[PDB]
Write a protein that binds this ligand. Structure first.
Ligand SMILES: OC[C@H]1O[C@@](CO)(O[C@H]2O[C@H](CO)[C@@H](O)[C@H](O)[C@H]2O)[C@@H](O)[C@@H]1O
Length: 228
């Protein structure tokens, strides 16, 4: 597994090399990539290839201030673009994203919200929106959850966390909470129910956005402007 080749294939930004290159030495990464490629040859896999690692482009590893974990990408064309929860700018926010934006609006009654659900602005500001499974077969939710992305992604998050003391993690729902278990004494770990529409627990009362900024300030880190 060669870094230059891998980087070129997925248009990965090079600032992430120290965090991702080590993952290429894990024998299981080769298996993951061969299976991902096998899937792309036999299915309409989403998001498009050039977007699978869009999260490496919006900000560098040292700019990450908050990590929000997702599960699987949207499986309808035109929705997913490589970031957890986010959808392309011309797509009315699906239920889970609508729920997240509503909590944001409840936390910040004055925020000037655009009404769209493209979280590129958050990503550029260092809010890492990462799915534990990066791809999916069109029309079949979570269809790629067993191909190996979760270990690769978890590895990257682990290296990022060791490199960076003081991160805020927002772990929403069971799956997110089981996949990433950051040292609570080194990082601010915030848990909540799932913004997924299947949850019968309202996501609207989530105050993580406010809690996160108070934490960042105690660590002399600039707060996040959550408007979007
Ligand atoms: O439902 C109206 C409106 O309420 C919001 C804001 O809290 O979310 C609630 O309702 C959803 C179902 O429509 C739930 O899935 C969600 O958990 C709950 O907080 C908005 O998201 C929604 O537009």
């Amino acid at each position: 597994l060669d870094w230059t080749t891998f980087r070129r294939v997925f248009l990965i930004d090079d600032a992430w090399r120290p965090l991702m290159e080590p993952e290429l030495a894990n024998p299981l990464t080769a298996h993951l990539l061969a299976e991902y490629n096998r899937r792309c040859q036999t299915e309409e896999v989403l998001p498009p290839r050039e977007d699978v690692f869009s999260w490496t482009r919006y900000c560098t590893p040292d700019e990450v201030r908050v990590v929000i974990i997702g599960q699987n990408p949207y499986h309808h064309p035109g929705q997913a673009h490589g970031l957890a929860f986010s959808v392309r700018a011309n797509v009315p926010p699906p239920p889970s994203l609508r729920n997240v934006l509503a909590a944001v609006k409840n936390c910040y009654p004055e925020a000037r919200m655009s009404g769209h659900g493209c979280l590129e602005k958050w990503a550029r500001d260092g809010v890492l929106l990462l799915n534990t499974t990066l791809t999916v077969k069109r029309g079949a939710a979570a269809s790629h959850s067993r191909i190996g992305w979760d270990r690769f992604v978890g590895g990257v998050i682990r290296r990022l966390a060791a490199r960076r003391p003081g991160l805020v993690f927002m772990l929403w729902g069971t799956h997110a909470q089981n996949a990433i278990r950051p040292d609570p004494r080194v990082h601010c770990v915030l848990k909540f129910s799932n913004p997924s529409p299947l949850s019968k627990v309202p996501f609207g009362t989530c105050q993580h956005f406010l809690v996160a900024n108070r934490y960042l300030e105690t660590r002399s880190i600039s707060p996040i402007d959550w408007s979007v």
